[PDB]
Design a protein around this nucleic acid. Structure first.
Lengths: 34, 92, 154, 120, 148, 124, 255
RNA sequence: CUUGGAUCACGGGGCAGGGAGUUCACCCGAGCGGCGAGGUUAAGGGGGUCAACCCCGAAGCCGCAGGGAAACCGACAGGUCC
RNA sequence: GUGAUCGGGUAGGCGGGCGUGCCGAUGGGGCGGAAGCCGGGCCGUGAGGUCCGGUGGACCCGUCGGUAUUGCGGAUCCUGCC
């Protein structure tokens, strides 16, 4: 069980293209830190 | 620097004697913890490797202070409950 | 030569120059005595406060009596031959002889307070505070006659 | 305005312990750090990782009387003692193979406080 | 935390509450006018405070453009890229091509790359405009700038 | 003995001490029936100027020695008692008990019995 | 810290390790802040009628009547009116409903305070000092099986509490309940009631009904914990009965 | 009040009860506390033992880059000394 | 421990205490007589507190933490009484 931080990328990504980057970041973090 | 024991309690679920005492110190400052341990051990026949003192407290306009001590039966039982800053404050 | 200065008058109704000079000479209160050296920088200040003090040349016997009776250490403790023989290889009489003939300073005795606090003169001042000693009063320069007054005030 | 102290009883206890330790061991650094901790909250020290990395060496020991914050890199390993760490600062100090500890544990490991660098 | 008491509680019994003579705390004359009255321009009872502390308050200077036409271009620094590298990698912004790491800033939504701070890694920066200092720092770190 | 000496000091001091009362307590029944101290605050008050022939004002110099401040003239210090548990927890060497005025007879019988069998001085 | 798990008969069966929230340092200042904010969040606004005292019509006489310059009624009695030193007039500075009573506090400080209060409930000296009777309690901290979440009879709860050793604190709560002093008795609010134990549960299946009517006893779930359950009056160290499921949910949420 | 009050300067027959720096909005500071290159939710939504409690909600605001009327341009995370 | 080199004070600034009504907690008292009122004793620099006796006949207090229409000799002050 983990608590990934994604608002850090939400506030950075250009709007209308945030959920895709969020999914990719979810997968990346799950891979690396787990 | 004299001491009068006001209360003794026993605790089996924790395994410790709880001692409440009063320190008469007139024309003198608040006594030190080493001195209080020395006198309580000289009086009540306790093992200095146990016997942590929790607090000595003075009060406004008064030459009597109050003190609380715990005498444990075993190192196991004392370390199981007492924390590190209390264990370091003493000579342990 | 060592000069003795005694304060006689109050600083109310006096100039700040005089008040500050007296503070620098450590003469804060009335019937208080100080011993200094006869240097020009001190003589100028004495001339500035000439109208509020008496001063004159002091003798060794008088200084010995003064040390034995009104001398104090930090803590307002009396001076004793025990202390003097311990800290120095002398008695009070020899210390005073030296002090007034050079070779030694009062502050060489450790923890010596530099101000002597006297009671008022026995029989009273025999001259007005508003005039000078020369014209029959009390203020200003005496000579060896400051010792008579120190004796009366001891 | 009456300047109180901290309301954290643990800070108060640490300050008293530091002064007692100074008097016991015969040193000045503990008393110094005590008066620095009794400093008004609006003037409490704050240091970033960048400053430590800038003014430290490899194998140095450092004590900060306030908070350590995460901004910059750490290129070598050092031991840092402070009252409060940030998550990022702790993580970045662990990375690079350093250790982040408390002032009490520093007093244990080193009673005389020899070789320790004060930063504030 | 600290809950002090109000000083009216202390001044209860003081007869003037710290205002001075019993003539001193009255209406607008006791201030010199209401609001910014007397700050110049017709009266000068506060012209001294005006010239000591609030110059450039009376008078106009310049013009403003319409917000219909204003555009605020977004910018980013090399320190930011290097200090947020791993998140830009986790999420798209940095990706992979043949033997190269590439930084697509248009994705981020930025128009300018400014040149504050060192650059450590080598990269290919893909963006409209880049400042000469940033160009030099990038080409020293061993990378390229390919302008779109 | 020093405690007795300080007791004599306090007794003499508080015999000499006046009862501090406001400017003109003798003149208006609104002050005769509520006697108290109020500091004189007027611009032309002689009690404020501390003139001769006028009543005096309180100051920190009238205080009693710390050692004997607050003790019963007997020499003990007082402890209010409402129950027998409070009666206990008294040092019968330096403290005495004063029974609260709201306690009933049924209960103060018990308090007096326990004080008797404990050796505690009761001022009532 | 390892602890035993007790059954409804008062016997230890299992052994479990406490989570780290029970090792949180002690912060009575934050506990107090949070309790005071919670106090503020349930009080009603109060004000007077804004037109009260301002119903009379007046006329002042002015200079030259051997009288003061006060506004007075203009019929038979001619009593003064409308001024704040007149009898029946307006009040100078009355209470107002515009006034702000709400106090805000941040989530993270609130949660730190809750954690500290939990750690305090897991300490013996604080529980005793607060005023609770713990002469015959089993563990401090007391952890009991999940079978207690299903008891819906007050008499069965009575028996279980007798076997665990908190019936004496319940009796203290009953005994130390009094009729107030003052005017709160007119406004309801009589019978100032003392506090007893607090049962923290994972899920309610009848224990709420079963234990409700014992004086001083509170029942709460973990997801709905606050600092007023754990530190009534700003004083921490309340006698608390935990459950295994509640402690696991603590291991998960940590706050 | 006044430079100046025992005043031939003003207020003062007695007693009891009432009677005067309050609230909001913005701004400048401080004594504490939390998080910290980030901080913080508002309106509102869900649950509950239902005005207390718990969980969501970062829209927006301040800060991380300034200079310039504007178009525009766009910086030391450490070189030396006391 | 030091203070010959601290001890007057208006406007004004700062620190600590006494007292009054309500709330959350804790410890208590009361028809074997609470609150209030009258006269007295003791402690306290003091703001005040507590005890004794009498009257009275149903509620009251201490400690911690919060709140406030929170302290009168004056306003040719307001109401009532003399």
């Amino acid at each position: 069980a983990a608590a990934a931080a994604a608002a850090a990328a939400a506030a950075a990504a250009a709007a209308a293209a945030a959920a895709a980057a969020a999914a990719a970041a979810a997968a990346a973090a799950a891979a690396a830190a787990a | 620097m004299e001491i009068k024991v006001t209360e003794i309690r026993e605790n089996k679920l924790l395994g410790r004697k709880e001692i409440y005492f009063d320190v008469l110190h007139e024309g003198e400052p608040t006594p030190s913890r080493e001195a209080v341990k020395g006198k309580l051990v000289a009086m009540l026949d306790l093992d200095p490797n146990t016997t942590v003192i929790q607090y000595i407290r003075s009060y406004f306009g008064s030459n009597v202070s109050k003190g609380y001590a715990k005498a444990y039966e075993t190192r196991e039982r004392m370390l199981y409950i007492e924390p590190e800053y209390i264990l370091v404050r003493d000579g342990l | 030569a060592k000069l003795a200065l005694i304060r006689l008058r109050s600083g109310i109704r006096a100039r700040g120059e005089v008040r500050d000079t007296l503070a620098m000479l450590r003469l804060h209160r009335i019937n208080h005595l100080v011993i200094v050296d006869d240097t020009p920088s001190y003589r100028g200040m004495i001339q500035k406060v000439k109208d509020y003090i008496t001063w004159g040349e002091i003798d060794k016997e008088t200084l010995a009596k003064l040390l034995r009776k009104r001398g104090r250490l930090i803590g307002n403790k009396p001076i004793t031959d025990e202390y003097v023989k311990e800290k120095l290889g002398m008695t009070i009489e020899e210390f005073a002889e030296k002090v007034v003939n050079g070779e030694m300073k009062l502050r060489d005795l450790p923890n010596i307070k530099p101000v002597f606090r006297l009671h008022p003169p026995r029989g009273g001042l025999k001259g007005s505070k508003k005039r000078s000693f020369k014209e029959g009063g009390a203020l200003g320069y005496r000579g060896e006659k400051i010792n008579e007054l120190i004796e009366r005030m001891l | 305005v009456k300047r109180t102290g901290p309301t954290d009883i643990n800070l108060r206890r640490l300050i008293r312990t530091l002064r007692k330790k100074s008097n016991e061991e015969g040193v000045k650094i503990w008393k110094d750090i005590a008066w620095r901790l009794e400093r008004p909250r609006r003037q409490r020290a704050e240091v970033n990782i960048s400053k430590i990395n800038r003014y430290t060496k490899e194998g140095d020991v450092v004590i900060v009387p306030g908070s350590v914050l995460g901004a910059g890199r750490l290129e070598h390993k050092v031991v840092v003692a402070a009252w409060k760490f940030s998550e990022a600062a702790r993580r970045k100090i662990i990375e690079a193979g350093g250790e982040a500890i408390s002032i009490e544990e520093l007093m244990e490991r080193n009673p005389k406080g020899s070789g320790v660098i004060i930063m504030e | 935390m600290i809950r002090r008491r109000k000083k009216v509680r202390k001044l209860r019994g003081s007869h003037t509450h710290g205002w001075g003579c019993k003539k001193k705390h009255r209406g607008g004359g006791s201030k010199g006018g209401r609001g910014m009255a007397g700050t110049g321009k017709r009266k000068d009872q506060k012209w001294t405070w005006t010239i000591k502390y609030a110059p450039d308050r009376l008078g106009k200077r310049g013009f403003h453009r319409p917000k219909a036409v204003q555009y605020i271009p977004k910018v980013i620094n090399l320190n930011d890229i290097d200090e947020n590298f791993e998140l830009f990698k986790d999420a798209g912004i940095i990706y992979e091509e043949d033997g190269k790491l590439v930084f697509d800033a248009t994705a981020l939504g930025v128009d300018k790359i400014l040149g504050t701070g060192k650059l450590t890694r080598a990269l290919v920066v893909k963006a409209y405009y880049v400042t000469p200092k940033a160009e030099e720092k990038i080409k020293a770190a061993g990378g390229e700038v390919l302008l779109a | 003995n020093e405690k007795a000496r300080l007791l004599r000091i306090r007794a003499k001091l508080k015999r000499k001490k006046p009862r501090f009362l406001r400017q003109e307590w003798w003149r208006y029944p609104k002050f005769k029936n509520d006697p108290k101290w109020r500091r004189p605050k007027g611009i032309d008050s002689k009690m404020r100027l501390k003139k001769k022939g006028k009543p005096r004002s309180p100051s920190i110099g009238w205080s009693s020695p710390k050692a004997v401040r607050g003790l019963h003239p007997s020499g003990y210090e007082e402890v209010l008692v409402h129950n027998v548990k409070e009666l206990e927890a008294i040092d019968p060497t330096r403290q005495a008990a004063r029974i609260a005025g709201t306690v009933g007879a049924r209960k103060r019988e018990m308090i007096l019995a326990r004080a008797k069998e404990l050796g505690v001085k009761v001022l009532n | 810290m390892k602890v035993k798990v007790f059954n409804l008969e008062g016997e230890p069966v299992e052994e479990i390790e406490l989570p780290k929230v029970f090792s949180t340092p002690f912060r009575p200042d934050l506990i107090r802040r949070a309790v005071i904010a919670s106090w503020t969040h349930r009080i009603q606004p109060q004000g007077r009628d804004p037109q009260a005292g301002k119903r009379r019509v007046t006329e002042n006489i002015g200079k030259g009547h051997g009288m003061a310059r006060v506004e007075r009624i203009k019929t038979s009695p001619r009593f003064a009116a409308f001024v704040p030193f007149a009898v029946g007039g307006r009040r100078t500075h009355p209470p107002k409903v515009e006034k702000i009573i709400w106090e805000d506090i941040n989530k993270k400080e609130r949660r730190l305070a809750i954690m500290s209060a939990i750690a305090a409930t897991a300490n013996y000296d604080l529980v005793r000092a607060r005023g609770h009777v713990v002469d015959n309690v089993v563990q401090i901290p007391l952890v009991v099986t999940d079978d207690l979440q299903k008891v819906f009879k007050t008499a069965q709860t009575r028996e279980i509490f007798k076997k665990l050793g908190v019936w004496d604190d319940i009796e203290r709560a009953k005994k130390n309940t009094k009729i107030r002093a003052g005017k709160g008795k007119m406004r309801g609010r009589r019978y100032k009631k003392a506090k007893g134990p607090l049962i923290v549960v994972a899920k309610n299946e009848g224990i709420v009904q079963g234990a409700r009517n014992h004086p001083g006893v509170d029942v709460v779930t973990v997801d709905n914990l606050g600092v007023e359950y754990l530190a009534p009056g700003t004083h921490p160290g309340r006698l608390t009965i935990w459950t295994k499921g509640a402690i696991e949910r603590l291991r998960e949420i940590y706050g």
